[PDB]
Amino acid sequence: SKGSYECFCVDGFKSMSTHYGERCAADGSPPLLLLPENVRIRKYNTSSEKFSEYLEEEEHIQTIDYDWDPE
Amino acid sequence: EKVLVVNPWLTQVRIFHQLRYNQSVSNPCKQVCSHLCLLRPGGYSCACPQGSDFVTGSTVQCDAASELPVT
Amino acid sequence: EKVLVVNPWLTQVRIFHQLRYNQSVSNPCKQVCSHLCLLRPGGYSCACPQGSDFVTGSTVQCDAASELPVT
Numbered sequence: 689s690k691g692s693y694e695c696f697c698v699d700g701f702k703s704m705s706t707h708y709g710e711r712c713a714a715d716g717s718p719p720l721l722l723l724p725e726n727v728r729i730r731k732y733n734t735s736s737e738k739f740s741e742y743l744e745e746e747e748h749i750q751t752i753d754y755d756w757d758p759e
Numbered sequence: 760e761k762v763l764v765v766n767p768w769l770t771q772v773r774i775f776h777q778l779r780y781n782q783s784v785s786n787p788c789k790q791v792c793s794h795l796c797l798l799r800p801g802g803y804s805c806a807c808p809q810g811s812d813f814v815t816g817s818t819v820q821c822d823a824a825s826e827l828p829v830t
Numbered sequence: 831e832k833v834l835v836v837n838p839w840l841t842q843v844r845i846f847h848q849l850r851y852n853q854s855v856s857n858p859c860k861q862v863c864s865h866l867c868l869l870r871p872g873g874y875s876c877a878c879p880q881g882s883d884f885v886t887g888s889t890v891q892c893d894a895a896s897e898l899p900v901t
């Protein structure tokens with residue numbers, strides 16, 4: 689705009705005023721991290737801050753990607 | 760900021776969330792392709808497995824025998 | 831036989847049980863010692879901290895000031 693602008697955020701992001709600036713939330717379950725080790729893949733809830741068991745008794749893992757709920 | 764500490768066996772971090780991959784991106788493929796329908800800017804293209812070629816005169820059907828999807 | 835698999839940061843396995851350390855082994859020390867009462871085959875001995883020596887003529891009391899046990 690003429691000497692002005694808006695920090696709008698796209699669909700699926702609720703505007704949430706935060707500390708040291710404003711951001712937009714995740715509009716759903718807090719993100720997990722996937723953490724692959726040679727023998728297992730581990731999950732971690734970024735909000736709950738707890739590991740939980742996932743793929744185990746494996747060997748020589750190296751990299752990870754995912755498809756969100758295909759079915 | 761530090762989040763957490765894991766094995767030197769750690770090989771990735773990946774955020775497992777749906778907003779991370781926009782699910783409402785329509786596939787331009789018209790099901791015309793016989794085996795593979797790769798993407799390209801503003802459209803798609805046909806291809807067939809390695810060590811095979813298109814049936815002469817056509818850019819869709821390839822001579823390699825089709826295989827059933829895995830259950 | 832294998833038991834479990836864990837980080838290359840593993841440094842030791844130690845069995846935490848009471849039968850591994852016979853608890854009914856009586857300490858031969860007669861509380862005579864001033865600071866330390868070390869063991870030896872069939873008996874015990876007196877000693878005092880580094881940079882200190884026994885009071886002349888005695889093999890029990892040492893010149894270093896005693897310190898209260900830590901809570």
Ligand SMILES: *[C@@H]1O[C@H](CO)[C@@H](O[C@@H]2O[C@H](CO)[C@@H](O)[C@H](O[C@@H]3O[C@H](CO)[C@@H](O)[C@H](O)[C@@H]3O)[C@H]2NC(C)=O)[C@H](O)[C@H]1NC(C)=O
Pocket residue numbers: 698699700781782783784785
């Ligand atoms: C994920 O990708 C989809 C597209 O596959 C994005 O949807 C589009 O988002 C724009 C943003 O403002 C909307 O306008 C689109 O709506 C459509 O707009 C055109 C004109 O440009 C009209 O002709 C259509 O009738 C319609 O109103 C919208 N399109 C669709 C198909 O939804 C989406 O924003 C994006 N999401 C994220 C999180 O990246």
Ligand SMILES: *[C@@H]1O[C@H](CO)[C@@H](O[C@@H]2O[C@H](CO)[C@@H](O)[C@H](O[C@@H]3O[C@H](CO)[C@@H](O)[C@H](O)[C@@H]3O)[C@H]2NC(C)=O)[C@H](O)[C@H]1NC(C)=O
Pocket residue numbers: 852853854855856
């Ligand atoms: C842990 O150490 C204790 C000793 O500090 C062991 O106890 C002794 O075990 C023997 C095994 O047969 C018993 O005889 C002992 O009983 C006494 O033995 C003396 C002879 O040395 C006799 O004169 C006594 O009349 C009496 O029979 C017993 N001593 C005590 C004080 O209990 C114990 O076995 C050991 N446990 C393990 C698991 O190693």
Ligand SMILES: *[C@@H]1O[C@H](CO)[C@@H](O[C@@H]2O[C@H](CO)[C@@H](O)[C@H](O)[C@H]2NC(C)=O)[C@H](O)[C@H]1NC(C)=O
Pocket residue numbers: 716717718733734735736737
């Ligand atoms: C990660 O942790 C968050 C909490 O920080 C979970 O969110 C809650 O999950 C319960 C599950 O029954 C829901 O009923 C609540 O409504 C959720 N609360 C919020 C703040 O939305 C979340 O489910 C956890 N995800 C995983 C997979 O562990």
Ligand SMILES: [Ca+2]
Pocket residue numbers: 689690691692693
């Ligand atoms: Ca402006």
